[PDB]
């Protein structure tokens, strides 16, 4: 039938309907008002081409189709291959000659056709097939179907019109197709109630990504095997249940285990890191953070709504261990733009200058396409490797950055750039500080009150110790970065409770310094 699912095939409904429309319309259409003799199917392995061929052969009320299993033609003797191939078309010629137009349809199946078609034997066989399919005598009662997994390895002359006309591609099924396949393969279980009530097909369909029919059927089979082994004991003499075999319920846990351990999509995965750039979150230990975030929002809206300033840039300045990159990441994520990316030197290790330049160019080219986008660059000095001795650095990357900082994108699109560093004077000397439009300052912790507030927010010390720390600290000024503070706290907590405080304070005295 044309339902396409009574035959236990899913996903290819549209392709099957296309085959109906383009293939058998002439034959089913009334003869009075009134062909195609070539079909080629291709697609990745395990999509069901054999199923389509078999079901199409079964559907038509015609003689039994003939099939050849790969290269069963080549023979060490000369001319026997030609005799074998010619042996196939005898019945079609006889029927055409005797019954003329009123001749039954003939169906021929070429399995692994790429093997034979692509040295004298091979090209002679190809020429013989080309002549027979389309030669001096024209037949209108023969149908040929070829199947391949490597469409590129097929000869072009075989694909010309009149020989191979209808070309079909079988692809990976969609969620609906996966649902249909699971329904087909689990209808048998549901009929006899052997399936558990805890299994939800929709959850599996959502979970099963990029699983062709093979993958899904194999997962089902693995669940069967798990349930099946649950009722057998191996060691002395293989012995089975025979008792709970009646129940043999298939739980969802079996499906999960089969999906986890003994199945794999066989497709590559995508790795994300944007989360990794903010590990411990943000804590409001003082006013400045709010000011920084407000300025970020102001710049975001200026780039969003401006009409004749499509490009805008900002620079983030601060002393080391002041937590600069995290703030940039937070602002970028708050921007809520379709396209966001982070360029870091972490991924470029051992690269020469040209590689760095090309990577930056690629990132910016990708950014250009979208409507409005934002990009962030961190550790500029590490990007253009710099050393106080000499000094020494890379000129090429510096020129690339200077050029890229003031190139407007194609018409009607918006770009934002945020840069982070910790050595302003150097950038000023290199004449780069002029390129940026504006700058922001990220300070350290100055007064003991802020440090106490940070400790309170962290909640790693109790009131008793906090009293001594307040006594020792409130009468003095401090200078420390947040990252160093966390490192110091973790350092101190190692020792026994009695000494922690003193140790901690000692460490503070070691890092005590002024700007």
């Amino acid at each position: 039938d044309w339902n396409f699912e009574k035959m236990g095939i899913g996903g290819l409904d549209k392709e099957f309907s296309d085959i109906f429309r383009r293939a058998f319309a002439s034959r089913v259409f009334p003869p009075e008002i009134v062909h195609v003799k070539g079909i080629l199917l291709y697609g990745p392995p395990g999509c069901g081409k054999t199923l389509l061929a078999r079901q199409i052969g079964k559907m038509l009320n015609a003689r039994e189709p003939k099939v050849v299993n790969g290269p069963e033609i080549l023979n060490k003797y000369v001319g026997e291959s030609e005799a074998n191939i010619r042996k196939l078309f005898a019945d079609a010629e006889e029927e055409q000659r005797r019954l003329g137009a009123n001749s039954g349809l003939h169906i021929i199946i070429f399995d692994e056709i790429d093997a034979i078609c692509k040295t004298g034997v091979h090209d002679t066989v190809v020429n013989q097939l080309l002549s027979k399919i389309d030669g001096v005598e024209q037949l209108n009662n023969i149908l040929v179907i070829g199947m391949t997994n490597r469409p590129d390895l097929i000869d072009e002359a075989l694909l010309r019109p009149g020989r191979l006309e209808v070309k079909m591609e079988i692809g990976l099924p969609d969620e609906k197709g996966r649902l249909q396949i699971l329904h087909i393969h689990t209808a048998r279980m549901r009929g006899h109630q052997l399936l558990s009530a805890d299994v939800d097909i929709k959850e599996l369909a959502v979970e099963t990504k990029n699983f062709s029919g093979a993958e899904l059927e194999g997962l089902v089979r693995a669940a069967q095997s798990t349930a099946m082994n649950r009722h057998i004991k191996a060691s002395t003499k293989v012995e089975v249940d025979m008792e709970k075999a009646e129940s043999l319920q298939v739980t969802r846990g079996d499906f999960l285990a089969s999906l986890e351990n003994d199945i794999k999509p066989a497709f590559g995965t995508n790795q994300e890191d944007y989360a990794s750039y903010i590990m411990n979150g943000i804590i409001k230990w003082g006013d400045p953070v709010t000011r920084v975030l407000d300025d970020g929002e102001l710049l975001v809206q200026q780039t969003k709504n401006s009409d004749r300033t499509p490009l805008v840039s900002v620079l983030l300045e601060g002393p080391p261990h002041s937590g600069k990159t995290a703030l940039a990441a937070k602002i970028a994520e708050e921007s809520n733009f379709p396209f966001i990316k982070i360029c870091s030197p972490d991924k470029m290790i051992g690269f020469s200058e040209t590689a760095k330049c090309q990577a930056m160019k690629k990132i910016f080219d990708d950014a250009y396409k979208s409507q409005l986008s934002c990009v962030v660059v961190d550790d500029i000095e590490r990007l253009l490797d710099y050393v106080p001795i000499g000094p020494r650095f890379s000129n090429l990357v510096l020129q690339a950055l200077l050029v890229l900082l003031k190139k407007a994108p194609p018409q009607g699109r918006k770009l934002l750039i945020i840069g982070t560093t910790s050595r302003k004077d150097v950038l000023q000397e290199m004449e780069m500080l002029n390129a940026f439009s504006t700058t922001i300052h990220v300070p350290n912790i100055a007064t003991g009150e802020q440090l106490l507030e940070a400790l309170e927010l962290l909640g790693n010390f109790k009131d008793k110790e906090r009293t001594t720390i307040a006594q020792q600290v409130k009468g003095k000024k401090v200078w420390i970065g947040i990252k160093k503070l966390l490192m110091l706290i973790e350092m101190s907590l190692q020792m026994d409770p009695e000494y922690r405080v003193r140790k901690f304070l000692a460490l503070l005295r070691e890092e005590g310094a002024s700007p």
């Binding site: 060490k76 003797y77 000369v78 026997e80 034997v121």
Partner: protein, 43 residues
């Protein structure tokens, strides 16, 4: 460019066949009978 490259192996192909040789036997057999006939006529 590429240094000189070796050639690949050869795969010959025998011509004559068992069944084709049965057919050649079909060819040959009638000749002896025809010879008996002509010898009879001459005699």
């Amino acid at each position: 460019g590429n240094p000189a490259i070796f050639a690949s192996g050869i795969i010959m192909d025998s011509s004559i066949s068992k069944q084709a040789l049965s057919e050649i036997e079909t060819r040959h057999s009638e000749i002896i009978k025809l010879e008996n006939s002509i010898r009879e006529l001459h005699d």
